[PDB]
Amino acid sequence: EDNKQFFGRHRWVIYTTEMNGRDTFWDVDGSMVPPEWHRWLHCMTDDP
Amino acid sequence: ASATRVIQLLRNWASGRDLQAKLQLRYQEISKRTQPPPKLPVGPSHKLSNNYYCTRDGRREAMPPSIVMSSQKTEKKAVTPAPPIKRWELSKDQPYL
Amino acid sequence: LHHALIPHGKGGRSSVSGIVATVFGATGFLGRYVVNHLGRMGSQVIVPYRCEPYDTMHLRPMGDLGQIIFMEWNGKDKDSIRKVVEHSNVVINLVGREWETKNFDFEDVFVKIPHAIAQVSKEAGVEKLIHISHLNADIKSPSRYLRSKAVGEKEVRAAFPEATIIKPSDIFGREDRFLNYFASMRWFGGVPLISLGKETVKQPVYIVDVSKGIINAIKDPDAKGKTFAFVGPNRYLLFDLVQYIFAVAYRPFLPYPLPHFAYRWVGRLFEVSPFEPWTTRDKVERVHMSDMTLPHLPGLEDLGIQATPLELKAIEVLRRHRTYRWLTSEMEDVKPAKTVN
Amino acid sequence: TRPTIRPRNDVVHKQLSAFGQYVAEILPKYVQQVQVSCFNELEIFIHPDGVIPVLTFLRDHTNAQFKSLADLTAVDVPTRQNRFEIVYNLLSLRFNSRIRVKTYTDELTPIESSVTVYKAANWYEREIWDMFGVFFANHPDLRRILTDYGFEGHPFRKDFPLSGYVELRYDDEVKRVVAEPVELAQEFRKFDLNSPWEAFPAYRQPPE
Amino acid sequence: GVRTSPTGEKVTHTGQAYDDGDYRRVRFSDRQKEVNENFAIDLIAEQPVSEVGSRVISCDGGGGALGHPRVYINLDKETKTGTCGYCGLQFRQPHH
Amino acid sequence: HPAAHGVLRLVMELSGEMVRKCDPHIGLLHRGTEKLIEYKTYLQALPYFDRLDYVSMMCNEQAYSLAVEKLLNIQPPPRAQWIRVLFGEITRLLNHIMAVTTHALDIGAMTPFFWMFEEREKMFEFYERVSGARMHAAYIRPGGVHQDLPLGLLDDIYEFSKNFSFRIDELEEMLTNNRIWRNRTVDIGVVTAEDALNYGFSGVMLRGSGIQWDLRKTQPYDVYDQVEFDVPIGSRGDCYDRYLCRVEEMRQSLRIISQCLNKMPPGEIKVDDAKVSPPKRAEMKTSMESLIHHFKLYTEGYQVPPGATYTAIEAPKGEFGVYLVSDGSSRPYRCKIKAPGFAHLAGLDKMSKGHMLADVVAIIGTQDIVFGEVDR
Amino acid sequence: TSVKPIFSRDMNEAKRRVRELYRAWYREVPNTVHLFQLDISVKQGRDKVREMFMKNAHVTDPRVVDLLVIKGKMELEETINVWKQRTHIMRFFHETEAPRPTDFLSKFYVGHDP
Amino acid sequence: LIAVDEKLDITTLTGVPEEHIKTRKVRIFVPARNNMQSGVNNTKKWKMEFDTRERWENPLMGWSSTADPLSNLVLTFSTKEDAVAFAEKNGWSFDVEERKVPKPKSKSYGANFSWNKRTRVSTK
Amino acid sequence: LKKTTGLVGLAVCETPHERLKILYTKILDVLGQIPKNAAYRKYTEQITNEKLGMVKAEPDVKKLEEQLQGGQIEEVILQAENELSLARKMLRWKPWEPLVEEPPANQWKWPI
Amino acid sequence: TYKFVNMREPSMDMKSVTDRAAQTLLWTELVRGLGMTLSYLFREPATINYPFEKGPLSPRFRGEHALRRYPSGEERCIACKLCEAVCPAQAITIEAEPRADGSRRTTRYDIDMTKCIYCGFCQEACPVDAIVEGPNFEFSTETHEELLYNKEKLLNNGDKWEAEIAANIQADYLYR
C-alpha cells in the first residue's frame, strides 16, 4: 500500500510464483487472492 | 500529486489553467471506505395511534374516469385546454454565451 | 432400453433421440457432416480428437448444451479408446488418411486402428458399430490404400460380427478431395490423364447422401451385421467427368495423355512434402482405377435415400473455383455430361 | 397532510372537462365519447373514419394547437369485436397540454393513414402494421420495420405465443443460417399470480 | 461426509448418483463431479440441544436482523425437543 | 460499420458521394421488450426500462416509476424525489458526455472521448456505490428508491462536481472554436422549427431548431420545480448549435447537482405504504404483517387500479414517454415505450438532403441515436 | 353493405390483383437466382412460387385476398431490393427440415403427436 | 361494400403453422375456483387455453423442455360468445363448458339449536 | 425591425397588421358558407373577431404580441393560415352532421 | 429562463478585424489545441496496473451468486421459492421435499448464469439471507455448460466466499 499514489493505484499485489500445482511465474490471474485480501484490494473496506 | 516543478509550469502555461487547483485524480480527499453505522428514519406512518390504513389508502382513492360527454346519454365562450403559456424570461445569470 | 435412452421430443435440436455415438475421426469431411446430422437429431455425441482443439471448434455449434463432448485420444492407445467408447451405444469409424506419414501408414490407419476400435467396442458392449470402407476394396488391388482397406474390413468383421460396413464410391462436396483435386489442376498448365481418361468409369456419391445413409443405418433395425455400397445414380467416364468439372468451373480445359510410369513418377515427386501432399502415387492409382459394380450389395435406395445426382450439387463445389467473370453464372447454363449406362 | 396519497388538481380537471365539451360540440359527427381520468388526462373516443378530420382539427385549430404527435400505438383486446385500438397522443406547446384520441378497428378494416397530418405517423404506423396487422390505406411506404425479413405473423397480438413459432441456428451442411421450429431447452414457467379476492371495489363490474 | 456410489462416483447430500448403465456419466470423464463435502444434516445433528426453563422460547437464528424471522417454540411435549424449523435448532425443558 | 452505432443497416443511394436517399433499417436490436413486460410483473418490468436507453438508465427508471406511481395514486417521499432528481442529472451528464464524445469520435477526434470517459468511469463508480451495479442500477422504483445513500456519497459527488467544470472547459477548448470542427458541424442537417414539430423531434433537436420548450420547465415532475436552471436555445438548428446546447446542458446539470447537494432533505427514501413498497428487513423479520406484505409483494406484486396513462420526462435524448395500460391485475396489460430517438431516426432522411457521406455520419452523431430504445 | 373493402371490391378484381402479383413474381425468379447466387434452378423457383400461391386457393373473402396480395407484394419488393439475404430465400424452401411422417402408424411409432 | 353473411377466417393471415391450426382443440371455460381459498374473483371472466403437449426432461440439468409454441397461451374473454367468435375466426377447434354457478343455500343460525330436528349442533 | 425571429424557417414579416387583417377577413368570409347552427362556425368566428379587434386597435407590434398571447407576430400569422386551411377543409368535411355510427355494444369498456 | 448559446455577433473595429485575420492566417486556435494536448501528455496517466491493481468496489456490489449457511453449518435456504418467483429472467429453478429429519430444504437449486441479469432481486427477496450476490466478478469460462450452476456449485461458492460475504452483509445490512 502507498497512500501517496492516487486512489485506485494506492494498493497493489504481487502474486505468488507457485500456487497449488500451477507454475505461476508468468501466468497470474486476478482471482488468485483469497476472499479477505480480495475485499481489501478492491477497497470495500479499509482495515487489512 | 507528484510532478517536477518544471513540468508543473510547463503544463500550466501550455494548458492555460492552473491544473493543480483542480486535479483529475483523487488523493486522499475521498471519503473513507469504512464508515460509522447509520440510523435511517422510520417514516410518517410508523405511529402507534390515529393511524388506520383506511385514512391513508392511496390505491383505494382512485376512481373510474369521469364521463364528460357520451353520445349514448346564450353564447358560450370558446375555451382552451389551458391558459396560454407565458413567454420565457431571458436568463439573468448568463443571457448570452 | 435405459430410462435415459428413451426417445423424446419431436426430433429437434433440444430433443432426445436416444443415440449415444462416439464418432472417431470426426475432425474431417464425413466426420463433420455425420456429427452435424447427429446434433441436428439431438443425440449425444462424443468426438475423440488428437489434433489441436482449435481444429475442432467448428463442431461446437452442431449440438445443444451438453450434447457434444470432446475427449482426447491416441490412435494406438486402447485405454483412451475404451475411455471414449465406455458410455456410447453406437461407435462410428471414419479414421483414414490418403497419404502415409512418418508415424502412421496405410496399414496402421486402416487395419490396426479399426481393428483396435472394433475389439475395444466389443469389450465395452456397444450395441452398434458402423465402419467406413471403400467401394473398391480389393485384397490384391494395385493400391496399398485399397489393400489395407480390405484387410482392415476383414479384421473389423472378425472382431465385431454385428457391424455395418459402408462402402462409399467417392465423396464429392464442399470440403471434398475429388472435385477439388480435379479442379485444382488449372495451375499445372493442362490436365494429365492416363490414356486420356477414356478407360476409367466413376460414379461419385454425394456427401449429404452418405451422411444420411450412415444416420439411417443406425436407426435401421435389420442392418446390424451388413455391408452397404453407397454409389451415385449416374456412371461417368473420367474424361467426360473432368470435362464437365472444368465446364462448370468455367476454366480452359486442355487434357493430354500422360503415360502411367511418368504419372507414377510425378506422384512420387509430390509425396515428399512434409505437409499434406497435393497428390501421391496411391492417389494416382485410385484415380485411374474404375469403380467396381457390386449389385448384390444393398445401397442408398435400400436404406431409404434417393441418390443425389452430380449435376444438382456440382455448382455448390465448383462455384468457388470460378473467376469474377463467371461467378454469377447460373447452374442451368452448362449442359449435363454424358453418362455410361 | 396525507403524505402517501398523491395530490389532485381540480382546476386542471375543470379546464380539461371544458375543453372536452368544446371539442365534442365542435365535432359531433365523429366524437363518440369524452372522458377525463382522475389524474387529468383528456381522452376522446371517435369513429374510425374521423381520424383525419379530428386530427387536423386538433392540430391546426387556433384554440387547440396540438402540433406535436407524442405517440401512436395500438392495444389488442381479443374479446371486443374491433380488437385493435389505435391511440394517438398529442402535445400542444402553446397551451402546454396533452390530449389522447382513441379509435377502433379489426384485422380486415383499414384505418386512414395520418401521414398527411403528422410525419412521425409514417414510422409509427409502419410499427403498428408490423406489430398488430392493422393496414393503413394511404401510406407512402408500408412494410415491416421491426420484425425479421420474411417474418410471418404479427408478434404483439395477444394470440401470438411469447416464444414464437421458429428459431434460428447455423447449419454447417448448407453453410448458412436456417430457421427451424421453436424447441426450448427449458419451458417458460407460467405463473398464476392473480389473487382470488377483489382489490378495488370502485371498479367492480355490475353482475347485470 | 461424502458417500461413494457402487460405481465410484461421489454421492451428493440429496442422494443424487447416476446409475451404472446411465450414459450421462460420460460427462465426468477427464473432469470432476462437483460435490460439496459439508453436509448440513450431519452438522445440525452434531449441534447440541439447548435447555431452557420456559414453556415458550424464541429463536431468530442468532445475530438479530441477520438471522431468520423470529419464531416461538412451545416446549410442552416432553418426549421430544421443540425444533425451530428455520434453522433446525432444538430446545427442551430441564427434566431435573 | 464503426459509425453505425452498433446496429443500423442504412441503405444509402449515393450518386458519387452525395446522398440521394437514406432508408434506415432498424429492428436488428428488437427483442420484444413490450411483450416481455406484458408477461412480467410491475417490479420485474423495471430492468427492461433500465435496459432501453442504456445511456440514461436512471432516467428510464424514473419515467417508469412516475408512470406506475401516477397509476397507483401515491407519492414518493421528498428525500426520494430529491435523490431521483440528483441521479437524473448525473445520468444526464453521463448521456451528454457519451453523445458529445461519440460525435467527436465519428468526426475524427478521440482525446476528448478518452478524457470524458474517465469522467464517466468516476460517475459509474458513484452508480456502483449507490446501487451495486455500474450501469444497470435498478435503483429508482415505483414508490421511491431502493436504499438510502451511503455516508460519503454526497461528499464524493461534491468533489466530482467541483472538479468537472475544468473538464468541460478542456472539452470545449478542443472543439468549440476549432475551424475543422466548425466546418464539419456548421450548416449540416439544418431542420426548421415547423418541420421538427411535425416530425415529432423533442429536446435538444427542438432547442437547436429554436423552439423554447423544455419538459422540466413546462411540466415539472419530482422537485424539478424547486431548482433554478437555464434552458439553452439554438439559433441556426445545425450540428454545431446542438453541440453547444448539449455542453450548456451539461453546465446547467452541474448547477442542478449543486442545488440538490445543498438542499437534500432528511427522511425515508420510499413511500411509507407496505402494500406498495416492501418493508425493511427488521420489520419483515419481526412483524407478522410486514412479513406477509413482503411475501405478497415479492411473489404476486402490488395491484394497480385499471386505467391508461401516458407520462413523459425530459430524458437527455429528448421526450421519453411511457403509455401504460392496466386492467387491475398485478401485471401490466400494455406498455408502449415512446423513445425520443425513434422520431429523430425517422426524420434522418429529411435532414440528409443534399449532403455527403461524412455529413450523414455527422447527422447521425448529432441525432444521438441509441438503438436499444429505438428498437425496444 | 357499409363494410369497407381494402381494395378491388368484388372477387373478380381481387383475382385480377392475384394474377398481377403472380406475373410479377414469375418475372422475378431468374433475377433472384442470378443475384443471390442460389443453387436452385429457375424452374424450381417458379414451382415454389406456384406452390406458395396455391396454398391460399381456398380463400373466398375478397378482403383477405387483398391483404394476402399486399403482403405478397411487400415480400416481392423486399426481394428485388436485396433487403433479404440468401438465408431468407432459402428459408422459403425448408432445405434442412426433417421429413415428418403423416401416416398414423409412423406417427404412433415416433411420439405422442396427433 | 359487401355482405356479412359469410363466416370470417383469418388463418391465412395470422401466420400460425397449419399443424397448430388443424391439430389444436382449445378449451373455453370459466376457471374453477381455487378450492384452497374462498375468494371468487377469479371465476368472473372466461378463459381459452390449448391442449397439453409433450414435456420431457432435459439431458443436461434435467429441466422440463417443450416443443409446443402455444403451451403458455391463455386468453381472457368477457363472454362465451366472444370466446367462440374469436376461436371460429382464428380457425382452431373448440370445446365449450358452461359456467358452474353455485345454487343458493338457505342458511339460518337458529337451526343450530333446533328443538327436535337433527340440525342441532353438539359443539360451537 | 427585429433581425431574426429565433426560429429556423420563420422569416420576419415587414407588414404584420395588413397580413393579419387580410387573413382574418378571408377566414370570416370562409365561415360565411357554413350553416348558422353549426357549433364550429360560432366559436372560430368569435375568436377571430376577438383577435381581429386587437390588431385594428393597437398599432404597436410588441403590445399587439403581448395582447394576442400567441407568441410572435409571425407565429400568429402562421396560426391564422393554418386556421384558414382548417376552415376550408371543415367546409369540405361538414362535421356538424349527427354521429356517423354508435360503437358496438361494449366497445370502450375497461377493464375487460 | 433560457439563454442563447450562439447569438453573439462579432465586432467590426480595426483591432478585432486584424486579430481575426491573424487568427485566420496564423493558426492560433490550432496552436491552442496543440498546447492543451501537450499539457495532457505531460500530465499523469490514470491507468491502473491490472491485475496487480484492482478497481474500487462497494459493499453493495452484486457479482457471483452463493448460498450461505448458519454458523452451526446448517443451510439457510428453506425452499420458500421467493427468489424463483421474483426472478425477472426466470433463471432460478427450485425443487424441494421434506428431508430425512423433516426439515424443509432444497433438492434442486439451479441458477443459469447465462440467463441471470444480475439484478439482486433474489437476495432482497430472501427472508433468511440464504441466496446472496457475492463480491466475485471474475468467473469467466471457456464453455457454456459451466455457467449453469447448481446447488453443489453455489454451496461451494458460499463456502469459499463466506468471510467476504459476511463482512459485506455486516457493512451494508443497516441500509436494508
Ligand SMILES: CCCCCCCCCCCCCCCCC[C@@H](O)O[C@H](CO[C@H](O)CCCCCCCCCCCCCCC)COP(=O)(O)OCC[N+](C)(C)C
Ligand atoms: C526476419 C526474421 C524474422 C523476424 C520476425 C521475428 C523476429 C523474432 C525475434 C525474437 C522475438 C522475441 C520473442 C521472445 C519474447 C519472450 C518474452 C517473455 O516474456 O516470454 C514469456 C515466456 O513465453 C514463452 O515461455 C517463450 C516465448 C518466446 C521465447 C522465444 C522463442 C524462441 C525465439 C527464437 C525462435 C527462432 C527465431 C528465428 C526464427 C523466427 C511470455 O510471457 P507471458 O506469460 O505471456 O506474460 C504474462 C503476463 N505478465 C507480463 C503480466 C507476466
Ligand SMILES: CCCCCCCC/C=C\CCCCCCCC(=O)OC[C@H](COP(=O)(O)OCCN)OC(=O)CCCCCCC/C=C\CCCCCCCC
Ligand atoms: C517546418 C514545419 C513547420 C510546421 C508548422 C506547424 C504549424 C501548426 C501545425 C498544426 C496545423 C495542422 C492542421 C492545419 C490544418 C488547417 C490549417 C488551415 O486551415 O490554414 C488555412 C487558413 C485559411 O483557411 P480557412 O480560414 O479555413 O478558409 C475558410 C474561411 N472561412 O489560412 C491559410 O491559408 C494559411 C496560409 C499561410 C499564411 C501566410 C501568411 C504570411 C503572409 C505574409 C508574408 C509576406 C512576405 C512578403 C512581404 C515582404 C515585405 C517586405
Ligand SMILES: NC(=O)C1=CN([C@@H]2O[C@H](COP(=O)(O)OP(=O)(O)OC[C@H]3O[C@@H](n4cnc5c(N)ncnc54)[C@H](OP(=O)(O)O)[C@@H]3O)[C@@H](O)[C@H]2O)C=CC1
Ligand atoms: N473422401 C473420400 O475420398 C472417401 C473416403 N472414404 C473413407 O471415409 C473415411 C472418412 O474420409 P474423409 O473424411 O474424406 O477423410 P479425412 O482425411 O478428411 O478425415 C480423417 C479423420 O481421421 C483422423 N485421423 C487421421 N489419421 C489418424 C490417426 N493416425 N489417428 C487418429 N485419427 C486420425 C483425422 O483427424 P486429425 O485431423 O486430427 O488427424 C480426421 O478427423 C475414411 O476412412 C476414408 O477412407 C471412403 C470413400 C471415399
Ligand SMILES: CN(C)C(=N)NC(=N)N
Ligand atoms: C454501441 N454504441 C452505443 C455505440 N455508440 N457504438 C459505436 N460503435 N459507436
Ligand code: SF4
Ligand atoms: S440477480 Fe436478478 S436476474 Fe439474477 S438470479 Fe437474482 S433475481 Fe434473477
Ligand code: SF4
Ligand atoms: S428466497 Fe431464499 S429461502 Fe427462499 S427459496 Fe430463495 S434462497 Fe431459499
Ligand SMILES: [Zn+2]
Ligand atoms: Zn431458529
